[PDB]
Ligand binder design. Sequence first.
Ligand SMILES: O=C(O)/C=C/C(=O)O
Ligand SMILES: O=C(O)/C=C/C(=O)O
Ligand code: SF4
Ligand code: SF4
Ligand code: SF4
Ligand code: SF4
Lengths: 857, 857, 69, 68, 55, 55
Amino acid sequence: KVLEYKGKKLNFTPEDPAEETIPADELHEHLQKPSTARTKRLKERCRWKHASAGEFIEKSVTAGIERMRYLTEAHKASEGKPEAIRRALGLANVLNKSTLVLQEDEFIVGYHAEDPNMFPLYPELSHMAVQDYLRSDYSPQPADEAAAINEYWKPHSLQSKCQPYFDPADLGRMYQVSSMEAPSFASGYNSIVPPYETVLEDGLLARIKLAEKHIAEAQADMSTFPWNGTKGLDNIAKIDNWKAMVIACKAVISWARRQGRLCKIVAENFETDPKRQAELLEIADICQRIPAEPCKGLKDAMQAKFFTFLICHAIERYASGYAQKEDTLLWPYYKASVVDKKFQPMSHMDAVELVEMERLKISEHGAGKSRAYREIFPGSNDLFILTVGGTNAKGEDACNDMTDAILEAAKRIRTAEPSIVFRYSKKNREKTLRWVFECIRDGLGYPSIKHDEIGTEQMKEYAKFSLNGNGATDEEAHNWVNVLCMSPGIHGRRKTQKTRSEGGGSIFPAKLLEISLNDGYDWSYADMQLGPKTGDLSSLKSFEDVWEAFRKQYQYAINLCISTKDVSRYFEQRFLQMPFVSAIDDGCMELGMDACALSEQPNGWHNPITTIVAANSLVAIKKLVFEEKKYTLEQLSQALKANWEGFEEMRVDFKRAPKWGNDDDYADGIITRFYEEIIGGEMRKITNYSGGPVMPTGQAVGLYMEVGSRTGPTPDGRFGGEAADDGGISPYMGTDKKGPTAVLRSVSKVQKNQKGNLLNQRLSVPIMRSKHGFEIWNSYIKTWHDLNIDHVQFNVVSTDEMRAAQREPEKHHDLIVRVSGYSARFVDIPTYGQNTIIARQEQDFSASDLEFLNVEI
Amino acid sequence: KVLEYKGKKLNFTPEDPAEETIPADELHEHLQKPSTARTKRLKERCRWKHASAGEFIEKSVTAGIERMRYLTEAHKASEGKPEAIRRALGLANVLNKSTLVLQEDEFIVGYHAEDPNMFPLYPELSHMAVQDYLRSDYSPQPADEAAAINEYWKPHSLQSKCQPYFDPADLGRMYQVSSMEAPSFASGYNSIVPPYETVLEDGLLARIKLAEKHIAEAQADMSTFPWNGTKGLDNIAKIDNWKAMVIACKAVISWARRQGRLCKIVAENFETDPKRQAELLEIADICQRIPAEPCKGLKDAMQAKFFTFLICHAIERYASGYAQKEDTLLWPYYKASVVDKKFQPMSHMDAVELVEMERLKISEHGAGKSRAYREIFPGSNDLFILTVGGTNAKGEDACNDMTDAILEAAKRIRTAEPSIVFRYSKKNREKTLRWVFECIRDGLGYPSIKHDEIGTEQMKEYAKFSLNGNGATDEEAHNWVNVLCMSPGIHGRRKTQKTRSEGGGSIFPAKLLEISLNDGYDWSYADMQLGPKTGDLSSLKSFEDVWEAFRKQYQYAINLCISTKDVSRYFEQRFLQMPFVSAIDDGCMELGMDACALSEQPNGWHNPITTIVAANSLVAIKKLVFEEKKYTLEQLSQALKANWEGFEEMRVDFKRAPKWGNDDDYADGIITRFYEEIIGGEMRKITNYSGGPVMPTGQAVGLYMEVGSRTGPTPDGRFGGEAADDGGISPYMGTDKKGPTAVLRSVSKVQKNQKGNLLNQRLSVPIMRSKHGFEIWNSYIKTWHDLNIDHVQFNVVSTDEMRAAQREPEKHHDLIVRVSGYSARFVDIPTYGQNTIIARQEQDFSASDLEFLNVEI
Amino acid sequence: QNQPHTEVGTARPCRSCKWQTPDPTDPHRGQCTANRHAMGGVWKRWLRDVENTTCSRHEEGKLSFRDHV
Amino acid sequence: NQPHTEVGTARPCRSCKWQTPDPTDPHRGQCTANRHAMGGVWKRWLRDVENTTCSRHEEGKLSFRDHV
Amino acid sequence: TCKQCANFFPVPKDADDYEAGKADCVREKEDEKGKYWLSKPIFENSAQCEAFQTK
Amino acid sequence: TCKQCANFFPVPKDADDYEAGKADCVREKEDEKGKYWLSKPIFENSAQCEAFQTK
Ligand SMILES: O=C(O)/C=C/C(=O)O
Ligand SMILES: O=C(O)/C=C/C(=O)O
Ligand code: SF4
Ligand code: SF4
Ligand code: SF4
Ligand code: SF4
């Protein structure tokens, strides 16, 4: 294109001139540049386990059975013992009897199943999930033994413990995933923020010694005259917890050392290449010393990180995510290895190759989650979200050479997972910002940008509610990462989030609006009463009546949402203890408590998904039905029940009604109230297990497509089964004609009672691949920061490339797009989601847009 | 004899003149006078299950299996459910599948085993006890099924839960029952004070309705917007507890009604006598309405009382005792039936016959306790101790016609159990007092006397320490009964003691003094180190050094005792819930808590047994070893290791040293310091689970025989294996040579830091059985009350009748004697205990003795 | 007719129909995706019973992931 | 005359008439064979009733009257 | 074959513990002490024992 | 059997997981993606598998 700006003629020609000789519909097939030949071979040989539409993309991926079998064995043997010690014994049995895997060209080693094409299962979490796996084509084998395991675990499963405290009608409404996401105890889905810092600094031997010292001190206190029954009995649970930590840590050390032994055996007996043999011996020594001893170099740190990830996200319990401050966590070891060359001496490109291998190992991590969460992350194994950038405790820029290494590896290897979040501050140096823009302009979809000051202030605010008064300090508040996709949380040796029961889960306003217009009866999907009987159409005489009906629906739904999580946490700390995670947490170790019992930092939240559809529907109802009396509510209900068939003129009238993201005063006025007074305002009144408030972390993450299919037609003009809004604050597909700046100003208006909101923006490809684009992108980020919007993520892919990919998937396998909250391989996304992504407006910048953005060419 | 008193001539000739025509060696065989022929038939055919030396006296008594069988089934089926609901389900299964028993001539019906000659067992409490039962001749059958049941229960037993938290050496020291009684979790022994008042006043249907109302309110609170995670989760345990209460109460109602149905069936199909048929129909209707509905008459009250006792002491859990304020509890229904004749009209003699039948039913109650407690209550089924007399809330006399009916039934029917405790006050009317003296003069040993004011002040003082501020009020403090033998505790609808973990268990000073003289090494019994190494003999240079060595031993032992009890309670409330007891407690029902969790009234205590042996030994050590330097500590130790062989002169010198109970200033000074500074002083430093102090309740209860047989020779003059003192404060047998008044003054000297001290005294037969008996006994009790002595109990038996019963046991079946805190059939006591009882000094009253007592003829 | 109906022990269950995908939470339930609007919407219907339910549009087989949501 | 350990003895302490099982642990025992002339029954503790014997071993079992 | 015993007394339908086919097996016994009666819950179709009285 | 396999590597005495007779069964496996190795804990006395190579 060509833009006239302040007299200058801006030519949007790709920086690399050779890009003029590459066709536009295959561009992304020529952008990957693996740093070494080893990472190229690894990218070609990668065992991707992406999942979509509830099934796995590849026929080679199948569930394992070793974890179920060994956990069941240990549980049958540990009857009568303290539940924490029983959990430690279960983890120990799984780790001691599991098959270990070593693949060719690997440097970071380790796996979470008995075979590199498999993934573990979790019969202790949700028996319905294992039952769904048994009925699936990728079931664990032998099938009868897995069925016996599930039948044994059903009475002890977390689902069976949590369900007796709720109306079966409520749970039936929840499990439909239409107006409310199913509770985590019914699905087994979870998240965690592991304290990698403790593992990397201390080593597990130190944690064992600490737990043993505490045990001896407690036993001596129990034998101290004179005994005090009102204080001494507190030592029983502490001793149980500390013994569980010792068992789990000894098991993990033995497990890592057996992996190193496998490395040495393959070096001495199976491998022919002497270079490969020497490398295997080096890895074997690493796994020998790590994680028993503190980390001394960067390779030590990365191997320890991967071991801790395997235990905290796959083996001890299932937990989605990849939460960590990778650059801050790895910087001391980068300085030891690359800068100072004191232990494991390497160059910067060596660290780049190491991060490449880390990304590929994560790309091979199959997640044994339930069907619901094999549906809502199309085109990816799971959610893997790390955080870099930000500010330190003294408010100075936290960017370093390790951030640049991570970003360069992510740009070179072009893998969808793990996704990256960059906490942006004005303090952030321009070199790292150029690397972030390098990743974004290549269409990877990451790093997403988050407002650093907003997150730090949020951490400070939540810390005030701490039950033991040990919330994050003002200095600790700067050390935060995204828990899964969008919600900030503390990272470090202490006070990190340990379960999704603390925060997470979704509520869907679109279905709530639909049933508000039908007295709480979901006729479109389940033909059943999905909500309270807020009133028939004759009762909704004023717009305020519809507003209050939605308020009642929202209150009922969100109350169930948070209460299920708190009950899940109650039973998690009593029967689903994580002694290993508790061992590497300084607070759990000091207090002798389980990771789920102790909660020094509140972070309660819930995700409103499909908010903008309901908001636009409300704006259209107020505009046409009530204010202008052009259509009656009964006419609208008759048309909606008809799926707009024979009412097409009315459907277009409602579609053209004022919409979010056009800087429209009418639509934005109502929708800002909807966000702050209802979506955030009513949810804020709820208090969670930690004593903090629950605030909305708006996002969509694929559910927007699944919920929309389950949702019926809406006054917004959507037909039934049409996809909902892509992002929580994002404008709906093809509803924005005023350009990017107008969308930014609409997003700017909602500043109250939101813990986070997700904005998805599609930027023009020519401007981005042009030299002018980094300056435009920096200007947008600076305006967005001054606007105080919480988050922004960018997709830069031509429709032509995507349409070609739909027609020829094998040709377009390299291309990566961004769905909301994460990045996916386009060819692995179903046509439904691909079309929702294609229909996102590719935003072009005018002269007035740049003038608003304060661009200086 | 004939004693001249102040010039008047007192001749001690029996009131009954036929006693001059009965020879003195068979007297007590001709005193029983059953009120009706039915109770006479019941007395002749009574199925006594007396126990001695750890075995059962009769070969017809054998263990049952139904309780073990059905509890095991219910526990296997209830896995995964809340532990309280699991306990309720176990009780429900036992009650629903149990065989019910109806015997001839019974009016109060009901049993706790499948056969009238059998008793239940408790595999959930202590697996060692069940193992001991399996190796016994009275083992449950089939033996292999019982062994499999114990193998199933071992990992889940309470003993297995408590043992991991103590040094195995410490537990090994306790389990010998030599210096410290074994902890209740190791034996299964227990006690309880049931809230009979709630059952008799409300009926279980009301409790079920109340629990269901609470459940509904809690669930509605859990679904109330907005949810509060710091408050709503408290409802989970409450709902679990209330549902367990509903299950248990419905089971008990169904069980009682099935018993009534058995009565009706036997009336309609098996019985020929029309009088018996009508009686059976009456009992059947009673069991239909009782305990589902409130009691309306005296028969209702007695049947309900017996059912509640069966559940609280045998079926839901083992619990020794018969704790209740029987006259106060039964008075409204006696007044309804006998005085006002409003429902179930009866005469006074009818109530006497009813209490007779109750006493015989208790005489048929076999206790499935462990071997240790089949050893230490020789000559009785178990401990059954009820309390009558006392004062009401206003401080007025609590004696009534029901008290006299109970005492009259105890007088005519001559059964050892239940024993009676009479709380004495100056307010007590003279009519009841003679009924008390009527029982005592017959040699029954009961009713025992307790100081009312001391108990009431004790309840107030303990109430101050209540954790939730709901201790007994000053009015409630007057309503107290003995828990087992000697310790006061609140009775009523609320705040009653629910487990022996609150108070109970024993510690033995004689063995402690022995090991103090041997650096903590038990050479005499086990050849093992039983206590801390307080010091060798050359280190004990001062008498104060010996004192301090004993203090260190005592502190170690008492700390172990109280800590074992509190750990037992922790695991009782977590895995041994008693939902039925919780249902009939107003506090547990109101708060939705288990009977073992809630402790609104502290009552902590421990029993020092064999105190006077240690006290006299210390007095003799100071006398001869230090003050007179006649023997060195090494000479004394050499004599002890030789069992005084060749050291007889030394043995007589130590025996002739000043002893307790002779009003010796030297001995009483040292022993009073011993009681107040060490026995009471060190124990109160310890605080129990309820937050109250732990105070000594001195008593022997037969343990004195066993511990003496396990104790080596002592400086008091004992040979190895000889029995110790028979009470908490009683003088050692045959060591009091100054008459009864000197014993009274000595006992009165001890006033600080005690919760109770048992006093055994033997009064002369002619004086008590003469027409002057009451006046002398009343003067004795009046002076004993003015001397502020805690307790006294009497034996009225001549040595000749006891020797004749030893020679001709088959002709003295109705001879009843008093041991310590309980009464036993003399012929069922082993020769060892019989000889200890015979050797007690039969005291006689001089002129000066009566003058001290203010006897006015 | 074309809408689902109950048939006890039917030979053509929703379980074997290509338009069905198991429920996200309860594998005993299902989602019928046979109502495909011309504008791309997949108007799913909930299925309480996947073993004894059928309609006229029953087709044995299984769609690829591209044809599901 | 003192108790000694004999592996699998033909006459264990368990079957001796002078023995009564331990009050807490049936694997232990109480030897009541040292009866003083003055009435004392000086019991001695037995760690193992399965592999122990002395010279005074007499198979049988006293009545309760002869025990403590 | 545990239904036509003379000791088979069906539980009334109005009883709290009533189940389909449940009944009380009530027998009489006597030893040297006295005479008693035992009521055990059994079912209509159940195993018969040695003491089956006809009708 | 299952002891003289070329895939039978006895666990070193000093290893944290050492037991009497324990060993690693280490195989090399290859599909369309790549070549990997599997190490499962077995014992000297254990059942052999389909592919036994003599050491
Ligand atoms: O756990 C969740 O549901 C979401 C987390 C996030 O988006 O941060
Ligand atoms: O339970 C005990 O050891 C004693 C109780 C009492 O004497 O009340
Ligand atoms: S049989 Fe009919 S209702 Fe069932 S899944 Fe197939 S199309 Fe849907
Ligand atoms: S064999 Fe000897 S030591 Fe053993 S019980 Fe008999 S007398 Fe005692
Ligand atoms: S159990 Fe025996 S006695 Fe009872 S009803 Fe059946 S066959 Fe008759
Ligand atoms: S399992 Fe097979 S490959 Fe492994 S050691 Fe045994 S025979 Fe060899």
